[PDB]
Amino acid sequence: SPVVVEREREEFVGFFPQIVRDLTEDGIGHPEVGDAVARLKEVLQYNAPGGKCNRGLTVVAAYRELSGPGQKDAESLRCALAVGWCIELFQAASLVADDIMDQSLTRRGQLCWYKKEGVGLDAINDSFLLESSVYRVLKKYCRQRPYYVHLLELFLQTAYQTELGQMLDLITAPVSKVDLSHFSEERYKAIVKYKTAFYSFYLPVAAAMYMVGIDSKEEHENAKAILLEMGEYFQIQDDYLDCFGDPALTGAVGTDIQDNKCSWLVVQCLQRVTPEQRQLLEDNYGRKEPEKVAKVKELYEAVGMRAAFQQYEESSYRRLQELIEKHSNRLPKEIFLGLAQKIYKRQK
Amino acid sequence: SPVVVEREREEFVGFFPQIVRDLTEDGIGHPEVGDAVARLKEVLQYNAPGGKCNRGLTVVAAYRELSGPGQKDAESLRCALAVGWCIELFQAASLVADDIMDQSLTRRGQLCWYKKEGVGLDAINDSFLLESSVYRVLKKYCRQRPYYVHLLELFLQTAYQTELGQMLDLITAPVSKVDLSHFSEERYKAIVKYKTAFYSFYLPVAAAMYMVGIDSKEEHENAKAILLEMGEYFQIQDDYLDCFGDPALTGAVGTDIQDNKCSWLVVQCLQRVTPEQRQLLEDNYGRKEPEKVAKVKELYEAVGMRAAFQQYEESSYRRLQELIEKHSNRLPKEIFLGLAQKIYKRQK
Ligand code: DMA
Ligand code: DMA
Ligand SMILES: [Mg+2]
Ligand SMILES: [Mg+2]
Ligand SMILES: [Mg+2]
Ligand SMILES: [Mg+2]
Incomplete structure (x- = not known):
């Protein structure tokens, strides 16, 4: 629901300054480190805000769906928010670094933090500090x-x-050398499981779980199970949307197969290919040349990735409900659905 | 004592493989991340070993000096070692990064991890992983x-x-631009307090304290106090030794005022200078030109840093004992002395 979802969003966002203050207020005057904490302020402010917050928000709504009447106090609510921003801070720490290692230029429509003059490799320490910040908040x-x-x-x-998932990425798709040798189905799946699924989906729910008292390992597995299918489908989707989506496309409807990105389409391609076609990709891919790019995509529609997706989003749902069945015995299914209704969307 | 000190050292070093195994054994076969954990092994092995270990060793001896007869079991002893290697792992995580941000070439007589072909900016993620490792061990x-x-x-x-101390460094002495504007006495002292003192001296003792049950904040302050004087003197010493020491000099008796390093001598200089002399430094400093270097040092002996040190190591001791007095009420002074007898040494 528009009204609720957004009321929830407004409180989250409206919560950021607080965190900022938490992190720097008593540090800004410090006669020794004051220069440093003052710089921190900027880092937070440049990097933490600006995403959608659906990650941080997930803790909140889950907590909301899990707590009992006794646990909806203001205090309890603030923590949920606070723990929410933590996931946000952590991911920022991540991204800031994904950026230096990828020699990227842009992010969330602003220039990469490392590219700001006067910053540079220093950002290496800045993301360490963003990561520290998470535990200071806790x-x-x-x-x-x-x-x-x-x-x-x-x-x-x-x-x-x-x-680790990052590590696998860095090794599989080295952004200064094409090699589709290692673009496999299980490598992609493994990169996806680790690099994002865990922190994007499991983490916000698991957090809410432990906050209501579900500390049961095997109840963490039932969540982990369903949740991992989820974030996997999600990565795939981002993947499909990047190339074949548009109408209402969430910000940058640009793209990036210019970066020899181990995306699902590529992988799904190399399984549908002929040996000519493979060397076709093998050449034109990871290329910032309008011509190659068009070819690349030609290939995809040439191979028919279009339906492969519709058939995948296809099984993906189904499977999930079944997983909702095997694994939401003790937890409120409501959770995984609401999560799902914001994740499955479509775009053909 | 040679015999004890070294028996202690041999056990520490002989402990490394274990940690290595702890960190990767069950990870090396993992059908998903195995490639990744296999790479981790290398990172550990390239970077963690090779220092002196006096940091990690400090936990051990302290524990040894603090525990009671009931707490000297093998199990308890292994933890102390284990917690010791943790400080080692953490500092490595640090250094690996100090290296990329400084565009250094060498470390502990091997080439910087980032400079190894095939690695590069990837090391950015590698130090994140070295840091993770610390908590996996705990x-x-x-x-x-x-x-x-x-x-x-x-x-x-x-x-x-x-x-934070790092951050201050990065900002004060930017290694691609001389500016002695910000080389102050309190900035140096502040950089030193944070960047190394805390982790080099306080951390190993505080760890041992909490492991025997001293969790008293104010007993942590009495340690912090004495310990902070300690690591400060220590940094200073490294600083003096770098330029004016030699006979038996611990490995690389090379040097690096070619890197516009905010060292004590520089600071102690700029307070003893004339305005000519200042522009002298202002020019020739941070220069990899044999000629400038000689001048730089001329300046130091020209200003007489030599005795300034002897007078400083001078007060430094004294002060300490007094601090040993005000702050070792409840703790065994023995600690801070043994620590001191390995730290104060000299070299005129
Ligand atoms: C969460 C995380 C480590 C993202 C990095 O992914 P990426 O190197 O594939 O680049 P992008 O920023 O486009 O996702
Ligand atoms: C412990 C730590 C962050 C050391 C970095 O110091 P540095 O940049 O002054 O260089 P070096 O490796 O010579 O100490
Ligand atoms: Mg990237
Ligand atoms: Mg990447
Ligand atoms: Mg350095
Ligand atoms: Mg440095």
């Missing part, structure tokens, strides 16, 4: 809470798992 | 221990405080 709101340790362990683990 | 050995949270909070905080 210490701040949840330190005197039974679930403190769980949440600490949970963020630290996800951090490692994404770094 | 989860492994101290998860079922009363002091788990304290140690988790302690490493996370230090991480932030050094990053």
